[PDB]
Ligand binder design. Structure first.
Ligand SMILES: *[C@@H]1O[C@H](CO)[C@@H](O[C@@H]2O[C@H](CO)[C@@H](O[C@@H]3O[C@H](CO)[C@@H](O)[C@H](O)[C@H]3NC(C)=O)[C@H](O)[C@H]2NC(C)=O)[C@H](O)[C@H]1NC(C)=O
Ligand SMILES: *[C@@H]1O[C@H](CO)[C@@H](O[C@@H]2O[C@H](CO)[C@@H](O)[C@H](O)[C@H]2NC(C)=O)[C@H](O)[C@H]1NC(C)=O
Ligand SMILES: *[C@@H]1O[C@H](CO)[C@@H](O[C@@H]2O[C@H](CO)[C@@H](O)[C@H](O)[C@H]2NC(C)=O)[C@H](O)[C@H]1NC(C)=O
Ligand SMILES: *[C@@H]1O[C@H](CO)[C@@H](O[C@@H]2O[C@H](CO)[C@@H](O)[C@H](O)[C@H]2NC(C)=O)[C@H](O)[C@H]1NC(C)=O
Ligand code: NAG
Ligand code: NAG
Ligand code: NAG
Lengths: 203, 150, 52, 203, 150, 150, 150, 150, 150, 150, 150, 150
């Protein structure tokens, strides 16, 4: 299962996904079979440049006509760490004299290391890649997404940074609140549990 | 829109309003009972005389109940984080003020019963200090109301 | 093959925190109860006090 | 040592694990995931703000309760054989409750500037909001702890004064000075809290 | 539409409301029995004048039972997060309130049993204190039945 | 379909339930044996009938075991979270309730056996007291049944 | 398909299953020994009738050994999370129930052995108490057995 | 422009700077008052001559306040990280130094009050010791000041 | 192929296979020197009869040596991860079994040496139970074999 | 070209250089007090002759002061991680060495001051000990200097 | 081709042995000293014959030195993580085995030193048990040697 | 190529060595000082002899200083992980060895000072024991002398 890779001399953009599907009017059709090994992909409009990578995949006539996908990504110096940080920001769909857009939310990391994700789509129960309303008619999913763009040294993937993390913001909030309540409870429990009763009665 | 975690915090606040405050009251009552024992054998006529601390513990419980009911009626599915944390703050503050007041009343009630067991004139004095305990609970409750608006 | 990732599953934080806190709760409970049981008083009252 | 062994064990184990994970992260070149920025930004300031609001009276009431009971036990114990001191020693409990009064007025002051917003990404929440949340949380913590320790101190000195006064009835006029010198810090905490939360402009 | 882990909080409540409540009973009937052991000798005929705290402990156990059963009866596979948080909060609050009430009833029972042993007229007054501890039990129940529907 | 980590909660529930029941029963038998030995130093004619409390402790252990089998019988390789989780809750509740009831039964038995050494009349009453402990463990049983069907 | 790091839980299950039984046996042996030292300091001719407690304590060891043998026998390389989770749960259950049995046996054996030093009639009665302790340990094995096949 | 979380460090620096100094002053004054109250019964006619340690203890609160006032004044919603770290460092240094000075002053005044009650000639010597505590706190102040104006 | 990190666990087992074993034996001696210190002085005619506990506590060292050399020689850079967990399990489990045996032998040897000074007939009896104190240790060892080669 | 959080560590160094050192000084003085008054009750003339440990504690504090001033003066906005780490190390070393020296000086001063009240010839020997505990702090200073110039 | 942190684990071992073994040695010698204080006070003829435990304690320190020098020489830049793990394991094993040996040697040395001060015949016996403790230390060393050349 | 945090570990080692050496020397000097202070009340003529113990403590501190300055002859910008890690190991080992030494010298001097007090003949033998403790610290230095130079 080979990945798709741009060939500006030594390869520069590498993208891979274990599964990939797109649907127009709520009609699922698998597209991984037609890519990731099909050398006839129209990988023409794609463009590379130091601190910029426009990846474009134009598809031959299906779903009605030829349809183009466009995944943008760029890195930038950050003074706060003295590093180079990258993100892929916009998904653009091009169709019959028409265009559709999508933000990107969490796909980011150091430019030295590749990025990985398990589910990236615009469908509930996974959660990602949504723009301000305009519901449109476009479903777009990749399973086992992985990418690298800016400092590849060959036909290989570097260390993979994963979007999972040992914690999430809501978890941290709940944990801190529960910790405060627990500290207060154990203080009260200590005070009540030290109570003792008398031994003998008067007279 | 809002996250799904949001409903958590607010509900937890209600639980505090019926845990911590209640626990304080419990301690108070227990301690007072011990005092009555030490006073029952020698000065038997003043058993009912010492009904005053135990009720003054139960009032703390009452306060908790009030706020709990309120935070059981302002809870709705579509709550923003702002409201959730307001309610959590109210619940925490009222529960802890109840707890501290409960500890104070318990100790003061032991000392009061023991003191009156040997000196009738001390009676009024103990009552005075007991008031300064109970009022502390009210202070907690105050901010609860201030946190049902802002 | 091409040095791919581990295919780590999302919702990792949820399952991890769940396992950790349940395990800590059970371990602390068993430790404290066993500590209470081990420290218990026979009596050193008649059977045990008396000698000779 | 009866049950504090558990507390010491938890404390030591927690800090040992913290050191271990810290060094493990450091030598593994994996410090880019220890993003303090992520923790400080993705946690909504409302949680910090309401934690501060609660604490500002939590600690004040705790200190007041501690003071009242520690002075009350001694005054009533001494009054059993010296009824003349029963009413004279109200001033200690007055000073003890003064800290609660200060705490609640501070809660009223801090509670203002609580305008809800609708931002969801840190760039939208903004520097002013983050500064307001952090500053008012810090002010709440400061006033709470200062009032707590002022309450404990005045309770102790009032206990000593009440115990001593039963003996020689011409001593009460030369021991309130320490009481006032105690109340000074309780006021100092309040004014520092005001100085901190002066310039909050949340919105 | 809703995560599966939503079940978590809910059934944890269906456990906790039982668990802690039982712990309270285990203190109400136990330490009171230890007191009745001393009572039995000097006046063995006052066992009916000292069977109160154990019935109180049983009552609080019944309270835990009924809240736990009612909350468990509202279980479903597609439960919303909101309902789950509601059930957890109710269960925890009733459980800890029951624990505190059990503690108080146990301590006061142990005191008052021997107090009545030495001094008969204490007996009636002793009942008074117990009733107030029992009130705390009621209050816990109330909150759960305010959190079951709303 | 279902995740790859479902059985964990069910198995740990069964383990927790049985282990907590075992701990409670062990404590109860220990205390009852201590009291039995301390009393029997003087009057052998009663020992044959003083054994009743430890018997009841064994009954609590029995409860645990039976419940365990249920959590072991509804396990398959592909459980959804919901079922195994209800099993976790049932196990935790039964184990903790059994532990509390065993603690109370043991301390009651020791105290009562100590008391009956010199007043033969208490024995009947002692039986009733222990009953009001055993039923608390049995309450846990009922909860298990519910969470063993839904 | 199957995670490569699944054998860890099974290994831990076996290790726990024998280690906690070993701890229980060691405790029971130590307690019975310190009891019988003082017992036999005075009364010499009963140095052999009092060996039942240590033998009964060794049953915890044999339970741990047999569960260790069986849990290791069914181990293999390609363990799905199902069987490993079951294995860990069963081992943990048997180990901790064995620990509880060890505690009970040790305490009861000490008290009873020191008691029987003076009154031979108690001796036969002692065994009855110990029998219940053994029965508790048996339950701790039984649950594990089913979890080693389900 | 600076990052978004700049002010947290400065805020917490000021908070700790006041809090720890208040802790130290409270401890010092409490201990000194304990000593004075103990001593007053024997030789009341020297009370004015012995309050000096409390006056010296107040200077710790003064140091805490002045650093707090400066550090809060310098604060702004958009400082750089270098400044905020200077703020945190200065706050910690002054707070810890104040705490140590409070400990020293409290214990020394405690010993010295009784010592002077024993023998008047001790007095001047005591004063010298007090100075060698006070200046210690003073040193801390100046260090923090260089950190705050940097 | 397999990650080098797995070799970590293997080595860890080897460490255990010494350290804990040694600790067990050490505590044995750490009590024995006490007993014989307070035994020869009243009774110097049997100094050479209180060294059996020393060898009973020292054979644990031999067991640890055996398992340690086995684990050390089995280690290589081509070990599969499953095998490294296997070895870790064996090492930890034998280490803790040896520790338990050390505890038991130490206490029982103390009791035996103390009791021997007052009653010679006690001697043989202690030796009998001493065998049991060793046997539990050996039980752990056999598990290690079934856990290592397989 | 350098991160700004590199400055962090440096400022922390300053704090330690005045914090831990300061604590040591405080403790020393306190201990001296509990000797000095305790000595003046019988031999007042010796008071001026027993102030030396306090001045030595003063020098201990002065060491930390000077090193902190130097460290703070070295600070600047554009520091590389090298200089910041150097500052941190120097501050930590001097602070904790001063703490240890102060602790030793305190115990030594109390013991010697109490001792010299009975045997005057102790005096000179005592001072020898003091210097051997002062040079400790001196050594801290030395290493700090080597880190500041480099 | 190899990580850069590979050396870390190695150097941890390079400290570990030379700390931990050394620590044990110190402890042993310390106790031996006080034993001498309790022996020569009455009967001083055994001063030179009671020096053996001190050298017996220092032997573990020389062992630690040998292992430390080996591990120091066995550390180069082109190391692989496997041998680094081996060195860390050997270091920890020797360190903790030496700690245990030092504890045992010290305890028996103190006890037997008192016992021989009182009574001469125990002397020979003492040496025997002490040697056993030392042997345990040596045993740890052997393990590390294997791990340093595997 | 070299990382940006290499110097941190080296600097922390350089600090920790001096800190732990200082703590050890402080403990040793303090304990020996109180010992000779207690001693000197009886026999002033031995005073100048009894100062020998504390002298040894000072020597240990000297060792620490030397190793520290050695680390400060190699620190530079582009240090690989190797040299910094070696500095860390060496510093930590020397520091903790110094702490062990200080503990041993402290206790031995404490006992031996009174020992020679009651009977001067012990004196020479006493210093013999102390010398052993001293060489312990020396060993630590030697290890660092191989690593910091490497
Ligand atoms: C996701 O994609 C969006 C569309 O490309 C990005 O652009 C944002 O679109 C919003 C909707 O048009 C803008 O909001 C409105 O802008 C108009 C401009 O004329 C203002 O009058 C309105 O007040 C304003 N309404 C708001 C803010 O509610 C956003 O301003 C616009 N943002 C930018 C930077 O151009 C989104 O930015 C992109 N990312 C995110 C995080 O939303
Ligand atoms: C990518 O995902 C799609 C959608 O789930 C998979 O296609 C499905 O395959 C299953 C199994 O045979 C069928 O029942 C569905 O009807 C298919 N759906 C569609 C839309 O084709 C597809 O197999 C996945 N690709 C791979 C290689 O596994
Ligand atoms: C690859 O895709 C690009 C982008 O759509 C195609 O370019 C278009 O080509 C058609 C046919 O000549 C023109 O009418 C359009 O104007 C072109 N579009 C743009 C944006 O330049 C290109 O032809 C495709 N290549 C193949 C081989 O199909
Ligand atoms: C968008 O352009 C596409 C490509 O031509 C059109 O898609 C199909 O067009 C055919 C022929 O007219 C219709 O029968 C289909 O119903 C269209 N949809 C699909 C899913 O195949 C589509 O009509 C264009 N949309 C416009 C002009 O609004
Ligand atoms: C890209 O170019 C490299 C170098 O010529 C070649 O090995 C590789 O197969 C090419 N990949 C694709 C997908 O065309
Ligand atoms: C290409 O990179 C250069 C150099 O940074 C930059 O100026 C230019 O804007 C980039 N191209 C685009 C289309 O942004
Ligand atoms: C990428 O690799 C190149 C070539 O070694 C190097 O100059 C650059 O610093 C690396 N990092 C980034 C962020 O480009």
């Amino acid at each position: 299962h080979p990945p798709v890779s741009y060939n500006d001399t030594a390869p520069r953009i590498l993208f891979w996904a274990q599964n990939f599907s797109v649907a127009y009017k709520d009609e699922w059709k698998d597209l991984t079979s037609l890519t990731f090994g099909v050398e006839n992909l129209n990988l023409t409009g794609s463009f590379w440049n130091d601190s910029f990578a426009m990846l474009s995949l134009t598809y031959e006539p299906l779903f009605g006509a030829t349809v183009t996908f466009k995944f943008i990504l760029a890195s930038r110096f950050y003074p706060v760490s003295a590093r180079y940080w990258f993100a892929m920001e916009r998904l653009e769909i091009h169709s019959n004299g028409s265009v559709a857009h999508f933000n990107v939310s969490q796909v980011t990391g150091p430019s030295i290391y590749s990025f990985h994700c398990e589910y990236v789509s615009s469908v509930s129960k996974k959660g990602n890649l949504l723009v301000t309303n305009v519901p449109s008619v476009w479903q777009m999913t990749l399973h086992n997404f992985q990418i690298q763009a800016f400092n590849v040294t060959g036909e290989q993937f570097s260390y993979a940074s994963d979007c999972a993390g040992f914690f999430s913001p809501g978890i941290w909030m709940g944990l801190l609140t529960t910790l405060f309540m627990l500290f207060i409870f154990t203080y009260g429990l200590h005070m009540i549990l030290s109570l003792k009763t008398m031994d003998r009665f008067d007279d | 829109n809002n996250p799904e975690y949001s409903s958590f915090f607010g509900v937890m606040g209600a639980s505090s309003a019926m845990v911590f405050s209640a626990m304080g009251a419990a301690y108070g009552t227990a301690k007072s009972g011990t005092g009555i024992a030490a006073m029952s054998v020698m000065r038997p006529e003043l058993i009912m005389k010492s009904i005053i601390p135990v009720v003054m513990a139960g009032i703390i419980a009452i306060y908790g109940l009030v706020v709990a009911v309120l935070i059981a009626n302002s809870l709705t599915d579509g709550i923003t984080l702002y409201r959730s944390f307001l309610q959590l703050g109210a619940g925490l503050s009222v529960g802890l003020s109840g707890l501290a007041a409960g500890f104070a009343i318990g100790i003061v009630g032991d000392a009061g019963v023991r003191g009156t067991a040997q000196q009738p004139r001390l009676f009024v004095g103990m009552i005075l200090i007991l008031i300064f305990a109970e009022v502390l609970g009210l202070y907690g409750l105050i901010v609860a109301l201030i946190l049902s608006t802002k | 093959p091409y040095n791919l990732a581990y295919k780590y599953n999302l919702e990792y934080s949820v399952v991890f925190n769940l396992v950790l806190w349940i395990m800590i709760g059970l371990a602390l409970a068993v430790i404290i109860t066993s500590y209470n049981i081990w420290n218990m008083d026979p009596g050193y009252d008649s059977i045990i006090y008396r000698m000779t | 040592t009866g049950l504090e062994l558990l507390y010491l064990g938890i404390f030591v184990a927690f800090w040992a694990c913290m050191v271990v994970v810290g060094i493990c992260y450091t030598i593994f070149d994996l410090g880019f995931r220890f993003d303090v920025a992520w923790f400080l930004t993705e946690t909504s300031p409302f949680m910090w703000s309401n934690l501060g609001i609660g604490l500002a009276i939590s600690l004040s009431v705790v200190g007041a309760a501690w003071g009242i009971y520690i002075t009350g036990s001694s005054i009533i114990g001494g009054g059993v054989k010296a009824p003349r001191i029963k009413t004279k020693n109200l001033v200690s409990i007055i000073f003890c409750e003064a800290v609660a009064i200060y705490g609640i007025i501070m809660a009223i002051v801090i509670s203002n500037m609580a305008e809800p917003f609708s931002a969801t990404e840190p760039k939208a929440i903004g520097h002013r909001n983050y500064h307001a949340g952090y500053s008012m949380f810090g002010a709440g913590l400061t006033v709470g702890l200062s009032n707590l320790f002022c309450g404990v101190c005045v309770g102790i000195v009032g206990s000593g004064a009440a115990l001593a006064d039963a003996q020689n009835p011409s001593l009460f006029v030369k021991i309130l000075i320490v009481e006032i010198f105690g109340s000074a810090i309780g006021l100092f905490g309040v004014i520092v809290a005001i100085l901190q939360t002066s310039r909050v402009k949340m919105g």
